[PDB]
Amino acid sequence: VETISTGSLSLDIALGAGGLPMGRIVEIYGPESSGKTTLTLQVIAAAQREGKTCAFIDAEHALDPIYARKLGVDIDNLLCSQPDTGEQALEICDALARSGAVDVIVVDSVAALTPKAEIEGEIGDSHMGLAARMMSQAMRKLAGNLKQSNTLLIFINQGGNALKFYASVRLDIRRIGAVKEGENVVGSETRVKVVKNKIAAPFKQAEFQILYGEGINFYGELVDLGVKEKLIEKAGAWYSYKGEKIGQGKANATAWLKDNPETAKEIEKKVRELLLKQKALAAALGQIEKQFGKGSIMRLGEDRSMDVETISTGSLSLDIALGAGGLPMGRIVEIYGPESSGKTTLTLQVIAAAQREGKTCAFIDAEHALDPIYARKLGVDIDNLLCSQPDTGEQALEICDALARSGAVDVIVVDSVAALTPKAEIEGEIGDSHMGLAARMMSQAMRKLAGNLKQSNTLLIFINQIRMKIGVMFGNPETTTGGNALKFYASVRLDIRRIGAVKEGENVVGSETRVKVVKNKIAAPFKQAEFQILYGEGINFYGELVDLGVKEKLIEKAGAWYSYKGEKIGQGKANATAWLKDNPETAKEIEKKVRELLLKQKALAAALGQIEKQFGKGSIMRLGEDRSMDVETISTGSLSLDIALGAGGLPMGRIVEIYGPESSGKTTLTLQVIAAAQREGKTCAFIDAEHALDPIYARKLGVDIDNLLCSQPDTGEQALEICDALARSGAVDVIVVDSVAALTPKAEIGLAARMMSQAMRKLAGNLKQSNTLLIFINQGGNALKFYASVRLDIRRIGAVKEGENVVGSETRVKVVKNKIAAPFKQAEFQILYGEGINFYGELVDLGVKEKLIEKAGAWYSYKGEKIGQGKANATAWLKDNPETAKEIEKKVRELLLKQKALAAALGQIEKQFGKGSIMRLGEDRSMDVETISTGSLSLDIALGAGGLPMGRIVEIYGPESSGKTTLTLQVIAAAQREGKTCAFIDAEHALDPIYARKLGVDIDNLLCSQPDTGEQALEICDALARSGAVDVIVVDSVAALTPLAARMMSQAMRKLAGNLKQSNTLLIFINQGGNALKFYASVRLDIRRIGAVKEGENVVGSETRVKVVKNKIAAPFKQAEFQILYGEGINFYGELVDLGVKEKLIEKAGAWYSYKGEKIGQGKANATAWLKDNPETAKEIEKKVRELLL
Ligand SMILES: Nc1ncnc2c1ncn2[C@@H]1O[C@@H](COP(=O)(O)OP(=O)(O)NP(=O)(O)O)[C@@H](O)[C@H]1O
Ligand SMILES: Nc1ncnc2c1ncn2[C@@H]1O[C@@H](COP(=O)(O)OP(=O)(O)NP(=O)(O)O)[C@@H](O)[C@H]1O
Ligand SMILES: Nc1ncnc2c1ncn2[C@@H]1O[C@@H](COP(=O)(O)OP(=O)(O)NP(=O)(O)O)[C@@H](O)[C@H]1O
Ligand SMILES: Nc1ncnc2c1ncn2[C@@H]1O[C@@H](COP(=O)(O)OP(=O)(O)NP(=O)(O)O)[C@@H](O)[C@H]1O
Ligand SMILES: [Mg+2]
Ligand SMILES: [Mg+2]
Ligand SMILES: [Mg+2]
Ligand SMILES: [Mg+2]
């Protein structure tokens, strides 16, 4: 029968037929990127140059028109099938088989022929085996509709045992080499095996080459074939054709048969024999059209764009490649693209053009992104934009359903696929927690949206991304790494990328983008559009505009010059661009010229409140709305934050996430609300996983530290669970959690962001019935993103200088999630070291924009009265008379806005978990434990307990040469001082025994180790924990215990935890590291050297501050200062003097120190070494302070 040339010579040869059998089914299978599609596009070429009109059944949405062109396909005369489903696909190809004169059909690809079933939800029992049965189905029916037409059908594969037997021929293409030009990639040595042949002989294989951007090289193989078949003679290097010399090497031998057409064709043949009407279409087309919905197959080179309604993308060159001149009103559009590609700009740009034509639009936001200010420069009327911030994946998808059945919502924008994270994930509900399974949630409420949008003319847009990734792999792009469904139910599909970026000299102010239209059931698919996107300006309207008035000779390219009807307009695209900018109409007409040359509040105001009734109160609104749901508010501290919050403070009994980088301000603000609350009565709780909190700073910020509740939990879980019952009290009005990331679970004591998901939903409710406001802090797990009622974005931007001195951080808070009022509004303000949020600073600014204070360029006036010059000097004038302040304070507010349950539920928590893991911070109440003296005095006072808790864990940390070691050795000393024997695990290979002696240890009774490995050390002290009364152990230092330098720890950390509470044995770790321990301590210390003690000229000291950071023994966050004398040790008398001062026993007369009216010392210095010389009257003060703080 009839045969079509493969494009390769030897493929034809191994086929036995000199081509691929017409009227049969032919399968080409093999690893991806092996030349599958090239070989394909090659037969479409060889047949295309013989009339034989061809069909391309496309589900890959791949195909490079350009690469095709150079392979040699009459693109303008090719039929492609952009099917709606795998079924429909496997029927359109059938329908063409029947229609006589449609010659060869190509399906791309078997794998992407995803069943109508999958496109929805559901299931089978030959399943994913559902395709192998959609195959088995309309296959017989095709098998015979081909021997009818001589119609050749070619299937491309990599899943369906039916196709196997109905194929008359099968090919095993694989990339097995590569071809070089000395120093380059350019080649791909390919190997094709004939597996199935009922046309001649099977099992024969044939080899050839593929060139990047040129295709199969049969001339290449021709030479080689002429070699073995006598016709061509090889004289070593110079190749021959019987006397007539042809070239040098294989490089020129091939390069010659290119210049000589006729002589080649001759040899071609001589080898072959030595081995081996137009309305049957056009009528039968409109047929498949009417039969399956209008436009779902076509020739590619067509001026036919149906006149369905068009909305401008913002880019001319996009509208152009769309075909229709805008996006299809009443359809689904997926714009996918690599993160930070430009997608959303283009997205906001459609919102732009539609809003400028009277229409009103929807924004379904699961990203919490959207820069209002940028949108406003972009062209979007933010005030009228309908914004939705859904509680969840499905819930989001269902809010569209009903914005479709409105009709006067014109365009819906969904941000974005990947971020529409479903219920099951939000709860943590396992089995397919396996996130990327609930893509079936897409397939679900998808089907229905199709209709609801079409009979509204509501245009909907989806945004996606793609996977290559866990984090970083090197596998390959699978179209749309959201869900399988959308891939078909989209009427049009966009691939925005980024390739260039552009410059204003050396600045980077641009981004060169490329949008590919890959799925197009409006017109010409696979058309593309390059243009520019400018930071803070938008799409380069004029940019592309020029480029078009090039090709449609309206603006004349005179090399580097740009002319408009004789008169010169710009040199270099640069100025041309920006010329049109200043003569708008001349452009907007040239616009129109290329567009000629290539192309009630009745129903709304009602269907709005319809969703608020059905889907939780206020789950959508115009962004410009004044309407705040009236629920009670706690002031953030920053007026401008309150304001942009919408409600005037944080929502009561709802969850709030404040996040940001480290050192942003997130805590200052956090502490500020705890303040503002405490000064209204309402009492607060602080759950601490961070052990951060500066008491002194809080005190100066305005926090009643004494009456604040602190909880230093052992496990994240436990932490949360504490909030649980702190919610069921109604007497904790504000809980603060520092911080999400640090709430590391028991399991870890990576994956368990699940813990966050857990007791989340239960805690959500308990707060509305308590007004218990809970605030989280992040830098976390997916659940919070949603259950939060308000999400805050603090970042630090600038700095504040007093003359020339860094005394402040200029901050910016952005309300990115707001289900209490208007979202996306922002507020900027000052934070000052040691004073906090700058009330007055923003107050001035407010009164300027609310016209109470008058800006005379640089001068600041308050009605007649001139109150300052330069923001600063004015700021600090309201600080000078709070009279006028408190008046303007309010006038701006006006222009923009028992102890039964407590004193009981407290101890309940102590009983439920651990005794003493919550308390008031200003508490005498210490507990009973054996306490070793730390060596200090004020330390053992700041501990509250008398010293370190026997048989718990204690971590001391801080910078190198801080005094870490010394401190410990001072403890070992004052254990030695009462029998308690000691071992000192000296991993560091530190310690100068000599020095040690000088500090006061019994050198000979401190039996100690110099371990080789981290482990040895661990299991050494492990065995000393069990070893009865060996009474305290110091590990110096966690440092040389990088061998999972915490997975190793978390091991024996569990073990030493319960071997100590047994032996009373106490363990002190030192650090500079390795998590777990952080929690497994009952006390933590922050040492730091901050001074130095001189004796005129000698560095003989180190002034030292130790903060009690973690204290599950008594009151935490207390601090103590003292002198450490090099080669003597801590200063008994040093800190003693000081204590006796603050306890009215020794009296400070400026520089003079007094005792019973008696002069004892001038300058702390001499005062000290006085008490050294009067032990009697010293020891006597010792006690009387010990009586007053122990
Ligand atoms: N735009 C292009 N520029 C240069 N070379 C290309 C281009 N497109 C394809 N190629 C070449 O062809 C590729 C082979 O695979 P191809 O012919 O596209 O079949 P395929 O395996 O079906 N592709 P896919 O199904 O997407 O994995 C590469 O090895 C390149 O050599
Ligand atoms: N404030 C801004 N100033 C300058 N350019 C901006 C600003 N905001 C956004 N852009 C532009 O928008 C970016 C393109 O990405 P965008 O349009 O946000 O799509 P996106 O990929 O959805 N972002 P994301 O979803 O966060 O990964 C940048 O390349 C900028 O061109
Ligand atoms: N002891 C202090 N002295 C001076 N300034 C301080 C002190 N403690 C905090 N600050 C200020 O607060 C910081 C801002 O970050 P902060 O309010 O601590 O939130 P944070 O990011 O949660 N801290 P962290 O959890 O350690 O990353 C700095 O910018 C300082 O302006
Ligand atoms: N041989 C010595 N004689 C006297 N004083 C010393 C001697 N060695 C160190 N010092 C001082 O006293 C030390 C106390 O610091 P130290 O207790 O070693 O802290 P550290 O953090 O454990 N050091 P490192 O282990 O290197 O991180 C430092 O302050 C030194 O300045
Ligand atoms: Mg392809
Ligand atoms: Mg966005
Ligand atoms: Mg803090
Ligand atoms: Mg040391």
Same domain, 535 and 652: no
Residue 913 falls inside a structural domain: no
Distance CA 165, CA 195 (A): 12
Q: Tell me the CA–centroid distance for residue 934 and ligand 5, in Å.
A: 74
Same domain, 785 and 704: yes
Distance CA 1108, CA 941 (A): 10
Distance CA 251, CA 260 (A): 15
Domain boundary, last residue among 1090, 1109, 1130? 1130
Q: Tell me the CA–centroid distance for residue 961 and ligand 4, in Å.
A: 5
The two three-digit tokens of residue 617, written as one number: 């109160």
Asked if 120 and 485 touch (Cβ cutoff 8 Å), the reply is: yes
Query: Does the CB atom of residue 214 touch ligand 1 within 6 A?
Result: no
- What distances in angstroms separate CA 380 from CA 247, 543, 545, 1186, one per listed residue? 66, 20, 21, 70
Same domain, 343 and 403: yes
**Residue among 29, 32, 37 to mutate when testing ligand 1 (max atoms within 8 A of CB):** 37
Query: Does the CB atom of residue 37 touch ligand 1 within 6 A?
Result: yes
Residue 91 falls inside a structural domain: yes
Q: Amino acid identity, residue 907?
A: G
Residue 972 falls inside a structural domain: yes
Asked if 363 and 388 touch (Cβ cutoff 8 Å), the reply is: yes
Residue 501 falls inside a structural domain: yes
CA triple 1063-1068-1074, angle to 5 deg: 115
- The secondary structure of residue 384, as a DSSP letter, is G
Return the ligand number nearest the Cα of 539: 2
**Residue among 345, 494, 532 to mutate when testing ligand 2 (max atoms within 8 A of CB):** 345
Say if strands 734-738 and 773-778 run parallel, antiparallel, or are unpaired: parallel
The two three-digit tokens of residue 718, written as one number: 């436990």
Q: Which protein residues have their CB within 5 A of the ion that is ligand 6?
A: 344, 369-370
Ligand 4, atom 24, lies closest to the CA of 960
- The three-state secondary structure class of 85 is coil
Q: What is the CA radius of gyration of the chain?
A: 40
Query: Does the CB atom of residue 511 touch ligand 2 within 6 A?
Result: yes
Pocket of ligand 4 (CB under 6 A): 960-966, 988, 990, 992, 995, 1102, 1126-1127
Q: Tell me the CA–centroid distance for residue 882 and ligand 3, in Å.
A: 28
**Which positions ≥6 away from 652 have C-beta within 8 Å?**
631, 632, 633, 634, 733, 771, 773
φ, ψ dihedrals at 55, nearest 5°: -115, 140
**Which positions ≥6 away from 833 have C-beta within 8 Å?**
807, 808
Residues facing 557 on adjacent strands: 562
Asked if 1164 and 1140 touch (Cβ cutoff 8 Å), the reply is: no
Same domain, 491 and 375: yes
Q: Tell me the CA–centroid distance for residue 831 and ligand 3, in Å.
A: 10
Distance CA 991, CA 1097 (A): 27
User: Which residue range is the domain that position 855 belongs to?
Assistant: 839-880
Same domain, 1050 and 934: yes
Same domain, 780 and 757: yes
Name the residue among 70, 68, 69, 94 with its Cα closest to residue 83. Answer: 94
Burial letters for 861-878: b for 16+ Cβ neighbours within 10 Å, e otherwise? ebeeeebbeeeeebbebb
Q: Tell me the CA–centroid distance for residue 156 and ligand 5, in Å.
A: 9
Containing 327, the helix (H) or strand (E) segment is: strand 327-328
The two three-digit tokens of residue 1089, written as one number: 């050297």
Same domain, 335 and 458: yes
**Residue among 334, 336, 343 to mutate when testing ligand 2 (max atoms within 8 A of CB):** 343
**Residue among 462, 464, 496, 535 to mutate when testing ligand 2 (max atoms within 8 A of CB):** 535
Structurally, how many domains does the chain consist of?
A: 7
Residue 1179 falls inside a structural domain: yes
HSE-CB of 1069 using CA atoms within 13 angstroms:
28
Within 10 angstroms of residue 187's Cβ, the number of other Cβ atoms is 16
Q: Tell me the CA–centroid distance for residue 829 and ligand 3, in Å.
A: 16
Question: Which residues sit in the known binding site?
Answer: 30-37, 337-344, 660-667, 958-965
HSE-CB of 405 using CA atoms within 13 angstroms:
10
Residue 957 falls inside a structural domain: yes
Sign of CA dihedral 947, 950, 953, 957: positive
Domain boundary, last residue among 777, 805, 837? 837
Distance CA 457, CA 404 (A): 8
Name the residue among 530, 528, 526 with its Cα closest to residue 108. Answer: 526
Same domain, 52 and 100: yes
Name the residue among 154, 160, 170, 108 with its Cα closest to residue 132. Answer: 160
Burial letters for 359-391: b for 16+ Cβ neighbours within 10 Å, e otherwise? bbbbbbbbbbebebebbeebbbbbeebbbbbbb
Return the ligand number nearest the Cα of 1130: 4
Distance CA 1149, CA 1161 (A): 10
Q: Amino acid identity, residue 152?
A: L
Q: Tell me the CA–centroid distance for residue 816 and ligand 6, in Å.
A: 11
Ligand 2, atom 21, lies closest to the CA of 340
Residue 257 falls inside a structural domain: no
Domain boundary, last residue among 201, 217, 233? 217
Give the DSSP per-residue string, 598-662: ---HHHHHHHHHHHHHHSSTT--EETT--------EE--S-HHHHHHHSSSSEETTSEEEEE-ST
Return the ligand number nearest the Cα of 992: 4
- The three-state secondary structure class of 865 is strand
Same domain, 514 and 369: yes
* Resolution given for this structure, in angstroms: 4.3
Return the ligand number nearest the Cα of 1034: 8
Same domain, 381 and 438: yes
Distance CA 457, CA 329 (A): 5
Same domain, 649 and 668: yes
Query: Does the CB atom of residue 105 touch ligand 2 within 6 A?
Result: no
Same domain, 1027 and 1153: no
CATH number at residue 791: 3.40.50.300
Name the residue among 998, 1053, 636, 611 with its Cα closest to residue 815. Answer: 636
CA triple 1008-1010-1015, angle to 5 deg: 105
Query: Does the CB atom of residue 188 touch ligand 1 within 6 A?
Result: yes
Question: Which residues sit in the known binding site for ATP?
Answer: 30-37, 337-344, 660-667, 958-965
- The three-state secondary structure class of 217 is coil
Distance CA 190, CA 205 (A): 11
Residue 142, Cα to own-chain centre: how many angstroms? 48
Taking the CA of residue 463 as reference, the ligand 2 atom at the shortest distance is: 22
Pocket of ligand 3 (CB under 6 A): 662-668, 690, 692, 694, 697, 809, 831, 833-834
Give the number of residues written for the chain.
1190
φ, ψ dihedrals at 120, nearest 5°: -95, -145
Q: Tell me the CA–centroid distance for residue 998 and ligand 4, in Å.
A: 13
Residue 253 falls inside a structural domain: no
- What distances in angstroms separate CA 1118 from CA 685, 701, 1084, 1187, one per listed residue? 18, 17, 11, 19
Distance CA 843, CA 888 (A): 8
